[PDB]
Ligand binder design. Sequence first.
Ligand SMILES: CCCCC/C=C/C/C=C/CCCCCCCC(=O)O[C@H](COC(=O)CCCCCCCCCCCCCCC)COP(=O)([O-])OCC[N+](C)(C)C
Lengths: 86, 183, 469, 50, 89, 127, 87
Amino acid sequence: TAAGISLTGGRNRCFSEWQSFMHCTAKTDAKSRAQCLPNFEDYMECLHHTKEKARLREIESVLKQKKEGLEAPPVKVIPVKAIGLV
Amino acid sequence: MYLTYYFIEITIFLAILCTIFIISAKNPMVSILYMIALFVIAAMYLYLIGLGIFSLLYIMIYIGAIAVLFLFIITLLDINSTELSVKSNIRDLPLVLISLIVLTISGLMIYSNDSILINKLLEAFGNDYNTIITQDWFNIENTTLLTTIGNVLLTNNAFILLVLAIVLLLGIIGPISITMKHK
Amino acid sequence: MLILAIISLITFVSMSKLSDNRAIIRLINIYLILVLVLDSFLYLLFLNNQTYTVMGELLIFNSFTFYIDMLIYFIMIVISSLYGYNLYNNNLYKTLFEPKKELIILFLINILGALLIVHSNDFITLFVAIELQSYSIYLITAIYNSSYKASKASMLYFFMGGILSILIAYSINTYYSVLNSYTLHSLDSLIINTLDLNLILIALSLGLLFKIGIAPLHKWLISIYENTPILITIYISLIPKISILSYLVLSNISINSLVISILAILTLLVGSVGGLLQIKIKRLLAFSGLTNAGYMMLLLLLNNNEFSYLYYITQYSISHLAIFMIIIFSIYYINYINNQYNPIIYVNQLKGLIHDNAYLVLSMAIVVFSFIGIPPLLGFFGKLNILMSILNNGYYFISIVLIVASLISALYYLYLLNVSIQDKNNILINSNETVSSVLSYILSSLIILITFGFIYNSLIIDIFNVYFN
Amino acid sequence: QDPIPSGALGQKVPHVDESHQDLLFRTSHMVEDLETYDEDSPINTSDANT
Amino acid sequence: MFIGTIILVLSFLGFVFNRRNIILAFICLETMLLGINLILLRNSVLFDDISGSLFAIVIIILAGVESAIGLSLLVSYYRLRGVINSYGI
Amino acid sequence: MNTFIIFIILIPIVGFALLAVNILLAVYKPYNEKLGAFECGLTSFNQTRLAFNAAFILVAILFLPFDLEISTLLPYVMSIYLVSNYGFTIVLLFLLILIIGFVYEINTNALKINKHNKPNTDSLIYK
Amino acid sequence: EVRHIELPKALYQAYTKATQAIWWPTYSPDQVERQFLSQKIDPSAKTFNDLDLTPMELPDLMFKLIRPYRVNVSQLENKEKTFVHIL
Ligand SMILES: CCCCC/C=C/C/C=C/CCCCCCCC(=O)O[C@H](COC(=O)CCCCCCCCCCCCCCC)COP(=O)([O-])OCC[N+](C)(C)C
């Protein structure tokens, strides 16, 4: 079937994490799949980005509380007709 | 520039609006015309998400065959209909409201996997983070989406195309066999 | 080899006349017989529960499914002999039991759709095959279109099958939204621990089950089974039950299901007490299907249920098929034939049946004590081997409710006997025309399997020990 | 020709004669069971598409 | 997922509380099928695969043949009774 | 802003403008004998419902399963190089499964309407 | 159900003033003032009674003049089960 076939026929976005989990389940009998948990956790959060959104709201809640705000090399936004302006 | 931001939400609202004119319209074929409008709103959303191929497959297949079939039925057949009187559906209204709340929330529930029920729902609404699109130069040919569908319908799932041929055959044989009156 | 039958057949039926239709079915009957006889030996592939996956993670072939396949062919050989053979050579029975031109077409397309579920690994194979068999039940219901009841039943069945097809499709895509996967083979017993796949797999199970006749949504199926004629309804009762249930018994997605356990309790209750004060024989006979589909929903809660299931399947299929074939034979002895499509309805119409063809009452008795679970008959070991699986695995309130449901359901089973062994004033003394030899041999064969089929219980289990373990 | 027909709980059930398909029996109110007046019988059809 | 779920739920309730005619019940069924499509197509786009698009292009055809079959069932229902009731079948 | 979407916005404004110049510039002036549908200078009663032939409805019911094949052949025609020698045979088999249902349709003469203009087949047997 | 608005007089008057600048005949702004003035009949005059005529009432003749704008169960369904509808 089309297990890991992407839109262009390539491999999908979370193929490497899925194939790593399938390496984990290939060499492993039941009653010892408890070690195969971190590969599955990596796959599910590759799919849905749950821990990533959690971490980003943890750091966004701090970002609004500072009056200084941003003391860093900043990210500049551009309009689409100005990719290579300067 | 940011006028082009809320388009998806607009279509959602617009799609909502269209369904209320489907279920409540005095003439039937006027409501089937509102359904044709709902297919157009769907194809707007499918272009808007990035699937420009499907939008024209919807306008070809759903609008141009299924709706033409429906309008063609309503023309030369007899269908009584009653108007949306307040007296006949005001008895339905409380089970309508209860089912709106429950079916809507519980449809929003299974996209999420916390054991706590309230944490399931709030993960439905935490989407405001903007995905970063990176350019990867790994692909050398213009395999579009329709090319990949034609590779997977034809090699990996060829049997599904072939059982699908049996289904299209059945869709020929059936309507004929009902409406023959052989001899 | 159903494919070759359909492709050859519909080209052949396009060229035959109307009067040829009957004989066409005779041909197909013998065709299916030589698919059982000359092609059985494929059971040798399935030693020691060796399973195959064919067409690339698409169809799964084990020997459980091979048995379901063989069972579906056997019952079709029966049903096809019912359409393709005359009962009597009267001017009456030619206009009562007459096949349409395209009837066997929809029959074989339906069996194709019912086999592509039990053999199925993928979910889109599941969805396409449910859609194929659902269309076929739509059109088999509506093919006798010069009947008010059958057309109303086909419309009712269309809308109530459309809802429970979109519920299955919503459950498949809900499962896809949390796992980039189509198989329940991906689940492999670690994922169910750390993933809330309860509500998905249970909603998938429900949307598959409400098409059987499970009990919150059971009234519409009893209406379709009463409205359809007497030959269409022994097919559309049997086939979606054994196909959809042997899908859901093969893939064990509702174990410790509290919802399946409630609906099993509710099914055994309102099936046994539903069909008590009823006077139509197809009604009475269709709430027997509700309770006996209740005994399956128990086995869905089980792990490792492939003995109790298959034995009680071929039990119910032979008993089912026989009790519908008996009331085909009682039509010669009734004093009142209405309703050309459905000639016997009311259960008091078979009242003097012991004084006219008493061994039809011997037949009727033997099959109806097997529905109750009387131990010299084959229905009892089916209920017994369900009980051995229920009590093994912790379902103790389910077991006593099973028993109370069996006791209540014995009442309207024995009502058939009560009505049949009674006095009638005007008895038959002699008949000119007699019943079809090849067609009454089928009922005699279906009894001798029910009577003397407890013989082979030992042999079967030893064969069951080799090919599934 | 029984005195009282039985109904699996000892109830009284109607014996279905030809005399149950009239105009007053048509479109009565009842559950779909225990009901006479079928819609398909050769006295109710009476040249149904002529 | 909001547009597909809202189309599915509103179309489902419009199907259930239909008492006015029958062609509203057919078109509520078809708008349901559109909603299931929308949910799946979005999940294909977000997961980077044609896989759900494969199930989508198959269920397009199955929705089509469902329309063809069931509307011939309606013509069979209408053949013996020259009018369709407002309350339903 | 491409020049693709000026067009799809711009055709309607032209059509709305021509409809508007008709509504603004022509007189309106109706009455009852002007209103009413046209049939050849004679009014009549319209019958509430009329009968039709099964082939009329069968053309457009039957239309859709052939249309769904023609859009099923559309994924193949774009991937015809990739599935060399193999998807060819699968598409052959698909088209052949369709063609035998089509020859069912043409053998039944489903879309043909007969004529009841029979020339009195039965001869003159007398007495 | 014919529409009903009944908005205030001054806004209505300014609206009629706005619509006076258009070529086709529009509702007059002094026809607003005649919405207040009612039928004041002179008793020192001669009616239909003099010339021997009886005028026809509006309710008897409403139906004829309003005919073109007019828009338009079980025994039928017991009688329509004998006709032919598919041929
Ligand atoms: C020359 C070939 C003749 C064609 C035979 C076609 C048969 C079609 C009939 C299907 C349903 C009828 C029941 C068949 C039982 C097979 C048991 C079996 O053996 O089942 C086992 C396990 O069963 C089960 O789970 C439970 C099923 C229990 C059946 C209960 C009914 C018992 C009474 C009837 C059986 C005894 C009658 C013999 C009369 C002399 C696995 O099945 P298997 O893979 O070993 O298939 C065997 C291949 N055989 C057919 C070619 C030999």
